[PDB]
Design a protein around this ligand. Structure first.
Ligand SMILES: C[C@H](CCC(=O)O)[C@H]1CC[C@H]2[C@@H]3CC[C@@H]4C[C@H](OP(=O)(O)O)CC[C@]4(C)[C@H]3C[C@H](O)[C@]12C
Length: 255
């Protein structure tokens, strides 16, 4: 904490996290058994599970900032929490590109899909989220040699690839929709895509870019960067909290 203005910030973070696990738990309970796992609901299911892990780790992390400062276990929690965050961003990107592919070629999607590619790509995303967690961890990495000592920007490359592929998938979906017959439910489609892109860039992505440029330039959080880290953490928490809403509750409450 800089001097003050931290207790209310972590209280807001904790409340947002509480509603986050509430929503993630209800959506996980509904989709786990009261669902059919058609083609994308698997993505929503495991994304909601990873998000539940996220907000749970948030409620584990924040209340220890005010009492019993330790400065080491904190690094451990942010290090481990990097993995569920990467998983959640990967699942958001996968959902976006998967919807884009479904719209681009619907016949292939509905007929010629292997009907198990969802699980395969899900486990590949989880495995690659196990990887790329060694951005800041330049600690005893060389256990043997050709390894980027300090300027290791491969996880940054993965994150920027995820962001750009999500953006290009949304753009291609919009171009395909706007270059065809206008059935004109073209207000629900506008709002959902705009909301997903906005909640990915304005929220969530700030946490990733914060980690990226905080381990690229080794900043000790000084007293100048103890006010923006809280904002980034709460933005990521709110993104993870509202993530189940947009993808499941909007559809469920539509009828
Ligand atoms: C998501 C990114 C990595 C993603 C990436 O770039 O590929 C994660 C990785 C390690 C995380 C930082 C480690 C400790 C940083 C310093 C402080 O640590 P505390 O004692 O807990 O207050 C605050 C947390 C802190 C600002 C974390 C911010 C950010 O979330 C990081 C860098």
């Amino acid at each position: 904490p800089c001097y003050n203005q931290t207790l209310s910030f972590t209280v807001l973070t904790c409340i947002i996290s509480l509603v986050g696990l509430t929503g993630n738990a209800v959506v996980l309970w509904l989709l786990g058994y009261r669902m059919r796992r058609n083609a994308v609901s698997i993505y929503i299911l495991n994304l909601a599970a990873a998000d539940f892990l996220f907000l749970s780790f948030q409620i584990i992390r924040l209340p220890l900032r005010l009492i019993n400062i330790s400065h080491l276990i904190r690094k451990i929690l942010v290090s481990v929490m990097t993995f569920p965050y990467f998983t959640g961003l990967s699942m958001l990107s996968a959902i976006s590109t998967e919807r884009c592919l479904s719209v681009l070629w619907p016949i292939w999607y509905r007929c010629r899909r292997p009907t198990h590619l969802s699980a395969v790509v899900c486990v590949l995303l989880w495995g690659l989220s196990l990887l790329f967690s060694m951005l800041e961890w330049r600690f005893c990495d060389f256990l043997f040699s050709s390894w980027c000592e300090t300027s290791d920007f491969i996880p940054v490359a993965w994150l920027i690839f995820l962001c750009v592929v999500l953006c290009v998938s949304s753009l291609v979906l919009l171009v395909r929709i706007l270059c065809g017959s206008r059935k004109m439910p073209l207000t629900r489609l506008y709002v959902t895509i705009l909301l997903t892109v906005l909640v990915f860039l304005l929220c969530g992505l700030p946490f990733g870019i914060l980690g990226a440029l905080i381990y690229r330039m080794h900043l000790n959080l000084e007293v100048l960067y103890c006010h923006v880290y809280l904002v980034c953490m709460s933005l990521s928490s709110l993104n993870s909290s509202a993530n189940p809403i947009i993808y499941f509750f909007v559809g469920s409450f539509r009828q």
